[PDB]
Design a binder for this molecule. Sequence first.
Ligand SMILES: *Cc1c(COP(=O)(O)O)cnc(C)c1O
Ligand SMILES: *Cc1c(COP(=O)(O)O)cnc(C)c1O
Ligand SMILES: *Cc1c(COP(=O)(O)O)cnc(C)c1O
Ligand SMILES: *Cc1c(COP(=O)(O)O)cnc(C)c1O
Ligand SMILES: *Cc1c(COP(=O)(O)O)cnc(C)c1O
Ligand SMILES: *Cc1c(COP(=O)(O)O)cnc(C)c1O
Ligand SMILES: NCC1(CC(=O)O)CCCCC1
Ligand SMILES: NCC1(CC(=O)O)CCCCC1
Ligand SMILES: NCC1(CC(=O)O)CCCCC1
Ligand SMILES: NCC1(CC(=O)O)CCCCC1
Ligand SMILES: NCC1(CC(=O)O)CCCCC1
Ligand SMILES: NCC1(CC(=O)O)CCCCC1
Lengths: 294, 297, 297, 294, 304, 304
Amino acid sequence: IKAGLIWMNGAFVPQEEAKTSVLSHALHYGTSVFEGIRAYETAKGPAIFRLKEHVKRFYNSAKVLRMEIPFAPEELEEAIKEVVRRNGYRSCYIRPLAWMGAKALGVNPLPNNPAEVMVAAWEWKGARLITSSWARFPANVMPGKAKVGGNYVNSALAKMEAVAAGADEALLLDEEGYVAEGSGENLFFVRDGVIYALEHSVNLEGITRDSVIRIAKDLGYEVQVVRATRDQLYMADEVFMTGTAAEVTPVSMIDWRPIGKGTAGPVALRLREVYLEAVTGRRPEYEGWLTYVN
Amino acid sequence: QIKAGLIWMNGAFVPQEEAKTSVLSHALHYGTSVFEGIRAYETAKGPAIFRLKEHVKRFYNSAKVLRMEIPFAPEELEEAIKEVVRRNGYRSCYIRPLAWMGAKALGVNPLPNNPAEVMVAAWEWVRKGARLITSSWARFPANVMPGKAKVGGNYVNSALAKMEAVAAGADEALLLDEEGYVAEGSGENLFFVRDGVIYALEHSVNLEGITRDSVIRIAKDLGYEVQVVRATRDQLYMADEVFMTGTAAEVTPVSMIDWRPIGKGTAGPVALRLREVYLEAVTGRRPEYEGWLTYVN
Amino acid sequence: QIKAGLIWMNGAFVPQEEAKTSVLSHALHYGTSVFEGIRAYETAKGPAIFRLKEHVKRFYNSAKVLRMEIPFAPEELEEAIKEVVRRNGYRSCYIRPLAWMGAKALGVNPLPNNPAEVMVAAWEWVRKGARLITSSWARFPANVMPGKAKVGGNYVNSALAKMEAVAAGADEALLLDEEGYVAEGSGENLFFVRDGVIYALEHSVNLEGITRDSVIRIAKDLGYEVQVVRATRDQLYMADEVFMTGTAAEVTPVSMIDWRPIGKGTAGPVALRLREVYLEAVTGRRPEYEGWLTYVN
Amino acid sequence: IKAGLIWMNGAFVPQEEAKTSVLSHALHYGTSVFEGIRAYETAKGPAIFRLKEHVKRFYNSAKVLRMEIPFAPEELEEAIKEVVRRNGYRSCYIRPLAWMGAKALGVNPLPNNPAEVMVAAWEWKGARLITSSWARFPANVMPGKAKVGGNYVNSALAKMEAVAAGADEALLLDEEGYVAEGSGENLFFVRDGVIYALEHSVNLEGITRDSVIRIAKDLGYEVQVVRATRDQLYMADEVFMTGTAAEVTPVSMIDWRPIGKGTAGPVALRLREVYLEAVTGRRPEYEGWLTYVN
Amino acid sequence: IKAGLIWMNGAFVPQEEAKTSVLSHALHYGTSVFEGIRAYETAKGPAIFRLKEHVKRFYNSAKVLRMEIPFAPEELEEAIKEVVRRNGYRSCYIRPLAWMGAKALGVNPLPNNPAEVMVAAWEWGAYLGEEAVRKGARLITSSWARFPANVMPGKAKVGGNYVNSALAKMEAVAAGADEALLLDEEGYVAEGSGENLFFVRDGVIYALEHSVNLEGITRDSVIRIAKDLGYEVQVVRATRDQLYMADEVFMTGTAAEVTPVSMIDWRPIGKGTAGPVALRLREVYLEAVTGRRPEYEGWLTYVN
Amino acid sequence: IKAGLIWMNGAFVPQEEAKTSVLSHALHYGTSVFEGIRAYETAKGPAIFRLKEHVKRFYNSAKVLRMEIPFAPEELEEAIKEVVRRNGYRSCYIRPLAWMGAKALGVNPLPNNPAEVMVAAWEWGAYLGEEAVRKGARLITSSWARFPANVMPGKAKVGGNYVNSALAKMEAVAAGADEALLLDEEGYVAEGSGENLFFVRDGVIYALEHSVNLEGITRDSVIRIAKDLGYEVQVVRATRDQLYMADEVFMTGTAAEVTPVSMIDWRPIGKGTAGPVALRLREVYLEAVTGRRPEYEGWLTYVN
Ligand SMILES: *Cc1c(COP(=O)(O)O)cnc(C)c1O
Ligand SMILES: *Cc1c(COP(=O)(O)O)cnc(C)c1O
Ligand SMILES: *Cc1c(COP(=O)(O)O)cnc(C)c1O
Ligand SMILES: *Cc1c(COP(=O)(O)O)cnc(C)c1O
Ligand SMILES: *Cc1c(COP(=O)(O)O)cnc(C)c1O
Ligand SMILES: *Cc1c(COP(=O)(O)O)cnc(C)c1O
Ligand SMILES: NCC1(CC(=O)O)CCCCC1
Ligand SMILES: NCC1(CC(=O)O)CCCCC1
Ligand SMILES: NCC1(CC(=O)O)CCCCC1
Ligand SMILES: NCC1(CC(=O)O)CCCCC1
Ligand SMILES: NCC1(CC(=O)O)CCCCC1
Ligand SMILES: NCC1(CC(=O)O)CCCCC1
């Protein structure tokens, strides 16, 4: 990974120096939290998309683990802006990470507080999905509203499964059999002119999902939030997923069954395009979501 | 901090201070690591590692679950484990082998990161009984997290349950499965005794404990009838005895659950006998169980 | 027997006696068929089929779930459906389109049997309210059977619930989902009314009824507030009204569930108004709903 | 399908004449029951394997549907023997089927009794499995102890999924996440010399499974019955499945993870071979399971 | 409990006579239904909050158990007004109860119909001050799940149901918390041992769906009040961690009124104390029940 | 119910005095525990079946609710023997009961400790004849599931639990059946509204696993008896259709003894009448409880 200078607990250092004890609690028990934040190039230079909203979730994830982050939100935000500038990035993916150190290896993480923190970044047909044989964890098994390290063993298993089956991404159902979300994407589907966003259920409350719903509504679409089954998606006119890295990705096939016309549909493509216009500063109406680094 | 000393890092030992890895390591972000807990006990004939092969086999089995490739043959890992005891001059210690996905990429898919990085570290190492509290967090279903493997990510569930129990004033947490049945402790297999019979809980969503396996064999050799069953919280509440097993936990009696005393309210005779015979076995004082020991020197 | 008369068999009509298929047909052994329920009502301007396109669209959608190929374009099927009414001289009738996997092979995998065989048949076709009993059979979870499609196999579940209710002295069965919440009748979507508000049950594991959709539109046009929610059996027990919808069932008031009277214990005013407006709509007596009708002659 | 003469409600008729109304209840609602019975060639001619046991289950399946079979067990057995003789079969698969006719199309099948019956027959590396995203129905959703037509929509979905993913067969989990069985095979796994048969849970009580357990025990193996998870199979020394058509089939890989050595193992191969010896009349000890037609 | 005169099947009697056979079906099998109604003192005398709505539920709960209440709703309402008057109470908690008697002890309660009915009322010993309200309630998620909708009738106030509430409450208290937060069997948030839950996030007030919870009248009242004040209210299903990161969390109930929640599972909610929204809702709610809100007088039944 | 003299917290009193406050916690929240014990007449006087085992469970049920029973097990056992003697009973049903009193009415029952205790006993009005036994009981699977192990304490005889049993029993009766068969939330067979289930298939006797059911003493007794007679007994989890195709099905309970099941959900079991195994087990069981089986005298406690 070409990260370059990484912010390590207060100070930037060369990538090669950004290391941590192999006895770190997080490395053994998945006790870490992270975020996914993107910077896009605009006519006025790099702009970070919904920075504060992402940082807030970062601290929220930490609270779920009762993990203590030894920095104020403002400092992390400044670190995030600086990881872009110092590395001379224009368009990049920023990865803040807080993890429990190597003070002790009992399964209880509290003794390891405060958490160590770092911020790294690196320059940045229709998706085919397969329904995973791995269900997304119930809300009382793993904290699904938080981006906690350990949670992604579940995403990792589903992703490898999908790829091995010849698809691009996995669609996970909850333990009851209802659609949940992709290994790392929130789901949407369109039917008879109406855009359906799936309820939060056990899924993460996506910021891209949020942005897409606002944009859809601003464009005049009717948007409903519902619980959905796989066959509701099979027969939808369109299906698409959202996420910081994934942006707005159309889904043209699920479980080898074509969605609608079998290729990216007009609604998803339009939302994606307007979303890209929003993140690149071409829409005054969404300027409030941007934080120009320069 | 942890006083581990020399740590085996992918083929060679290095000072603990040098045993570090990139913060961009896949496992540090996604919980994609596997580990083991192995113990060496002091015996009249030097340190002896308890059931080393079974532990290493499970280490590789856990890796297979994540489709993780361990770039070392089992024999090499076993040697590294014996050497971590020697080189550090340990007599009694907890050994922690760990394999994790490195920093080649950060997509959720771990495969592009193979082979895994590997390290082995180690550090020198009842009457009243333990007090448990049933967690408000259920152990993950068999199709949510691989409960038969010691996969790093799995322990977020254990961590949450453990903090909860300690916060409530208990020693350890007792987790139920999503259906409401007893599963296991945050990191211990459960047993209970009623009317002379020893009940080992079914594997269900729990890890197939090696200590559990040992205590069952021992119990049968002592002449106890052992049954494997599914259990509810109130079946434990009215048990004569309840105890936990684990490499670190060994055999620990449980005297109270959810503020309800178990039997007499103190460690029971059955759990104590099992514990005593187990400690005799791991310390080379039981000829019939010598096959379970691997002498370091 | 059934008096269907001329039946459309894969492209052409034949006497009912000739409308037969191999007993080695995949669908006869594995439930691999899909079907629809469509009605034609008599109007001052001749027979009219209610929402023909929506029904045909669902027919194809159901086929997609089984990855079944229907060797006919929607337009041809729609024509066959109009012709089944004409050729038999029906004025009011129930139309049953059916596509099933033939007899090319009997491995559980249906794909080798594509394309599907297709046929369309039809046969000529409240106050006290219906009595329901909650079934001891739960409607299948969304990852067990495709509850959004009218797949033949799905109805073993419906058949079991229906026989049970009738045996218990009730008219129809009310099924719950595996979690314990109300799902739907053996073949009817459920609604309930409380304090002036009409509650349509969420789709959950139920079929997305076309009659349900019609009654919701009608209800809103009449000025009623309509909410879509999840419901428990006792929320129905204390409702002012409860009613069922389906192509065959139309709009049927429910006066009792599990021997517990609903509201006054007879059909309620809201269900009756919805029913009345629906029958006016399907009989061409509502200009605003003409788009839902397809006149045969 | 080359079936030849088919027994149709009391009398044999040419295949082409073995037809039923497209208005048959079973064709619309999956209300039928069937069996899978095999005949193997022996030195003394064709021998049907565990005939009576299969017929008993046939009638048992019917009781679950409250379906009335208008023939006595003895008659069906005679029909089954005759479908082999008359067609001059040596080794074949026999398929008895009872289905609800076209008397009425209400979802309730009772009015359609008695059921129509027929009996047809036709001459007869390690399997790679993938875990299905379709769970086998709970015991209060579909009658899993009976071979009821409608049940197989669930098997059909799982099978197509597996094949489409590049595997040979699907492994289904129950709704709780535990291993259930294949789309149409009971599961077994071996670990440290012990043979583990999965409990019945929501699975069909396989006759091949039964035979295999008896054989295993007769051979001296220790056999236990347990509930199992997918990772218990992932780490087993061996895994295999049973069924009339499948016989004893070794499983060398599940979800792209090799089982043991990655090829058919010694235990499964041995059980399979002894099973074939039993069904072909080479084992006096199992002669009781055979019914010679000639 | 100092109840004084208690209405027993049609007539008032001293508490000492308000007793029933220890062979009563309900004492052995939880076959009873009850209500929790409050009378708040006003300058015009005691006013009972939403009496008919509570009485309708009392009868609705009885229908679930197929229990027959041998009195017209109007008789019960009169009894409820009189228990207040006859005891000279001002503010007080009213507890109507209908239970299966001692005719027989088979599990089937039908042979025991009609049910016996009683209405008792008593005064409060103490009230939480504003300081305590502001500190907020501390919750702990219970290891006991609220019963699925096909196990126990969650929309009815059936006695047997409260064994579940009792287990969770004792658990929470033993853990050092004030109240328990129960999840449903699926892992989602249900309600307190006896309180409906709400949470506020980014300006929006979220009321939890009914799922397996009781359809609280205080919950209903709070929603109406919130909307009348201009707040946006949404009804959703929620997880424990959605509450952990909410700006505010609060619970409702006749006895609990509107109670701010400052911490759940040792994780502070928002600022760690009661927030402005819950406190504002509590105030308006109290102004409503004490007859100081003209727009809500329709909810009050003055005893005098 | 004609109980006569009833033991009330340490002393016997006429039934008429055996009453408790209608403000008792258990009457409002199902917070009670009870037992079902029988005394069978013998030529040596009444003999109580497995008294200590029943008493141990009574106390075990109390521990689940964290209910304090202010009497030593020995005192209760004496009370149980005396209720029989003092009423001059021969064969009779004994019902011990401990319930939370009227100290306070918050859901938490702890403030109400210690619990009140009573022991009542009464005679049977009628018994099933062999003809009825042979016809067998007809069951119907309930639409109510037995509570999961983390919702209601299924191993304890807690009053509140029986709301679930009551709902299922009424349902079965209304449907025209004799008893209800409940499944667990997962869809598997649990037990009757108050009876443990067994089924026989191809010579083997299958006792159902404990899962969420009560660990029946009659169930335990039947298993011991079956094995002593040479039958092979296996313990398994079962589905409704495994019972549909069983050779025989029967249920056990103190009141139900050993009852043959001839039909479930309108589907006949085996021959459609009681089978030889269940009838044989019932006979030996009855010979045991009536003191005609020397090998089982250890299970009997003679009152005189
Ligand atoms: C990060 C993530 C998402 C996407 O959320 P965004 O805020 O839109 O980036 C979706 N699902 C999971 C499981 C995630 O971790
Ligand atoms: C390691 C572990 C155990 C104990 O297993 P042993 O082989 O006996 O050390 C039990 N449960 C969990 C979750 C574990 O990780
Ligand atoms: C056909 C059917 C309905 C009714 O749907 P309509 O489109 O209104 O005819 C409801 N439930 C099930 C299970 C059905 O098969
Ligand atoms: C027929 C069948 C089997 C195999 O049973 P055998 O009696 O061994 O042929 C296994 N599973 C299912 C679902 C089946 O239908
Ligand atoms: C009584 C009760 C409430 C509160 O409802 P209100 O009508 O507002 O008094 C909430 N939950 C439960 C379980 C209750 O019994
Ligand atoms: C009392 C009871 C039984 C019977 O148990 P026995 O000890 O044999 O009397 C069975 N099920 C339930 C739910 C019970 O309460
Ligand atoms: N698809 C990717 C993410 C989400 C996203 O930003 O689309 C989830 C897994 C971990 C990496 C991020
Ligand atoms: N209680 C501890 C362990 C198990 C054990 O060895 O008892 C599980 C959590 C991770 C550390 C090990
Ligand atoms: N009640 C009937 C239907 C639905 C309907 O049209 O109301 C479902 C079962 C199959 C026949 C149709
Ligand atoms: N694999 C096949 C069967 C089972 C068997 O005989 O192995 C199940 C699906 C329907 C055809 C039979
Ligand atoms: N916390 C109390 C109640 C609710 C209430 O009024 O807040 C529920 C249990 C039964 C008594 C009432
Ligand atoms: N059928 C009755 C009992 C069991 C029995 O003794 O059979 C359970 C409910 C409570 C009374 C006892």
